[model samples]
Target: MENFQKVEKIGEGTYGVVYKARNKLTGEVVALKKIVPSTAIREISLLKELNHPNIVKLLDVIHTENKLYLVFEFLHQDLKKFMDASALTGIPLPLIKSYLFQLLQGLAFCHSHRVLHRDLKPQNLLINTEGAIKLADFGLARAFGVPVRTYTHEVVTLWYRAPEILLGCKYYSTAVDIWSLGCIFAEMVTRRALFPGDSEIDQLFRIFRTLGTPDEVVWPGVTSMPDYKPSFPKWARQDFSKVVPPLDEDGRSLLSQMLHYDPNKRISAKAALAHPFFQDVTKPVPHLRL
Candidate 1:
């Protein structure tokens, strides 16, 4: 513990507090997360198994009597802050595309490993000076293997959460993360949340208003969800071009697939990478290793 010196407090979350710190011995800057022993095991084990340029690297783990510390490479800020700084003029289209591509690349790696990033929001995505997006905060992440088991419905943030999870579906897969990516993709273009809902029901209604009320026809089993109700107000879907004018046709097409009502039909991270929306992005980056 003496080897590092705390620089300043960075953030506070449900599980722990984060600090910007400096390594006294090596003179390296890092982010230190102070967490209880209970939550450390899962994050540590999972981060150890996952490694990619788009995923935040876990540098070291320090143990104390009652608390555990996770050391990570320091990032300039999160996506939310990055967006806020450029709110006046909005992010450039090319930069937004680059960020989205990096996000998808990281997510694809996670899904390929059968891991679910239950809590994906702008706040959990870190950005460096080079405009690299690294998925961070693995406290809510879980490894999902074949024969998917039931998971807690209470995961992703309200705005980015999927409708199925909002309606009490417990067998969610990578589709939940895809839903978040859709919300994020829209936000990157407009500099605002696509569905800024206050509560679970409100969130569902917000989604319904934008995507139209889902029926058994669109989502095979949506009517049978635990929270489904005939009394809910029916809403007509809005056009993506009207809602997000900055996005091109290809971008809108990719966005719609990510926000599909049916989880089974939603585009996978790997498939999303191949969408025409990213056609103009520079090709042959070694990060994807494709």
Candidate 2:
């Protein structure tokens, strides 16, 4: 704590304001996320356990007079800011494959270790100068995989939340992250949010228009959800080919698989790493080399 001096405020985050700081002992720049007393223990405990290249590196946690601190590598920008500065709107068709590919790699590592990020969006992902993508903010993450166990639905932002969550399904799975990936893919192409729903029902209807409403038979658990009700107009199905008509074939195909309706039937994170979309990336990775 005494060894680091705050250089400047970075930005506000889920835990609190972050700062870009200088490590007094080593004279190296680092990122510091400040947390209030109540959330300090939960955040620190989670950050300490996760270590991956594509994931934010949590160097250490420090406690002093009245606050808790999380130290990490300093990055110049996050994905949102990266998007704003890029020459291409959205990520651009050519680089979309590479970005999504790397994203899945990071997610694979998270899943392999049984951690569910719960919240995956553009802002929390940072790109280093080397063109590496890193997933940040483990404050909402948890070690999951208890069969039929329910977690709080108060996780992902509305734009990236899965359909089951909007339907009030208590129990979720890795499918949640995949659903968020789908939203990221859409944002990459549209350069805006895919479904900025005003309510849970509105979100489902938005998805239903693009991907078609799931027949209750397809999801026996659908009615069990707390939000279950007969509402919203179900529309004629749109072809996946048409949903993202502007994207390259490889890009759209990759997006389709990620957005599949059934969590169990959707593309697994590991398999996504092998898609041809990323086959030509200058730096290929079976897993993000974080």
Candidate 3:
């Protein structure tokens, strides 16, 4: 702890409190995340194994008698804060497109590594001054195998939870993260949550009301899900253009695929990166000094 100086309290969550700290020697700023032992091991293990430009960098690990400290390369703010600040004017379309692409790049890397980032939300996506986005918070992440094992239903935050998980389907995969990305995509366009449900059931209804209710025809075996109910109200699908008017045609198409009720049908992150929605995006140029 003596090696760094606490600059300020940055955030607090279920896992631990985070502080904006500076290295006493180098004077470099970093985020010092303090967590208890139970969650630390899993986060550290997964983060150590994964390294990608779009994912937050874990700089160092410090262990205390009872607590663990995860030192991470700090960013300016999270997507949540950035969105809130731009609530009135809205994020620029090109910037939104770029951010989504970066998120997909990070998620694709994690999925390729057979790791599931069970939790994905605006708050978990960090952004720097240069407009680079990085994925953070692996407390709920887990490694998956060929035959998907049953995972807890309580994973992603309620607002961004996929339909399958909300319906008590535990054998989900990378599609869950895609669903959350779809929500984030819409939020970026409008600066508000696509599905701001108060409870699990309410969240499901919000999604159903927008995307239409699912059945065996659209989503095979959906009726057999643990929480499937016959009494639930049925709704027809709404056009993405109508709900998220700010998004263009290509954006709507990608959003629709990402929000598909069937996990099997949902687009993968790698595939999403190739969608026509990003056809016009130009690669960033390296800075040159004359």
Candidate 4:
């Protein structure tokens, strides 16, 4: 307990309070998350078994009498804050490509392990001074195995949720996270939330208004989800460029595939890494150092 010197409270969430701390012995900076038993059990149970450069590294887990502390590799800031700072001029296109690739690569690793990052948003993505993005916050993540199981429809945040999930699909797949990646990708270009809705219904409608209302024809079983609502306003799909004006043809194409009506049709993280949009990005991504 005395091995770490607390620097300051960096963040607070439903699960825990994060602190910027320094190791007394090693003098290494780290992010320490102070959490209760329940959240600690779930978060560490999964995080301990995973390892990826693009995912925040869980350094050590310390349990005291009543609380648990999770030590993680320190990062400079989160994507939300980074984007907020760059909102005026927007992130450079080259840097955007690198960051998005890292995000997808990390997601691909998780999906390959059959893990679903049920909650993925800018706030959950950590960015170091080097501009490397690492996916964090796994409280809502779950592993899906064969003979698919029913999960709570209330998984992802409303804005980044897929139409199938928004309609209340109980059994979902990795596609949910891809939909979120699409939202983040668009936001990276526009420097604003792609869909800023006030409520669940509003969020669904915001998506529908831009991508058009989905039907049984395009989304086969969308109308049969547990919370399917037929009362949504019918809207035709709008131009992709309007939402992400600076995106090139390749970028627009990839984003459309990612935000496809059918979850099955959505682009996989693995596939996205190899798309034409990333061809200009050098293979064997160079390590980004601050």
Alpha carbon lDDT of each predicted model: 0.81, 0.72, 0.82, 0.79
Preferred candidate (lDDT higher): 1 or 2: 1
Ranking by lDDT: 3, 1, 4, 2
Q: Best candidate, lDDT-wise? A: 3
Model 4 Cα lDDT, one tens digit per residue, 1-290:
79999999887643467789999989999998765446546666677778898988878878788767788888877888878877787778888888889889999998898877777888789887655789885433442221122232233346676667667777789998999889999999988889877677888889989998888888887887777778867899899988799899999999999999899889999999999999886323322334
Candidate 3 scores a C-alpha RMSD against the true structure in Å of 5.5
Q: Give the backbone clash total of model 2.
A: 1
lDDT of 2 by residue, 1-290 (tens): 77889899877665567889999888889998765344646655666777777888887777778767778888776777766665354465556666777788888987887777777878888876666778886534442212222233233356787888777777778878988987877777777677777666677888888887776665666665788676657676677666665777777777888887777777878988887777676543221122
lDDT of 3 at 286: 19
- Please provide, for model 3 over 68-162, each residue's C-alpha lDDT reduced to its tens digit, 9 standing for 90 to 100: 78888888778888788777888788888889998999999989987777778888898877668899864344421211222222333578889
Clashing pairs for predicted structure model 3, backbone only: none
Model 4 residue 209 CA deviation (Å) reads 0.4
Q: Model 4 — which ten-residue stretch has the worst lDDT?
A: 143-152
Root-mean-square deviation per candidate: 5.9, 5.6, 5.5, 5.2
The Cα error of candidate 3 at residue 109, in Å, is 0.8
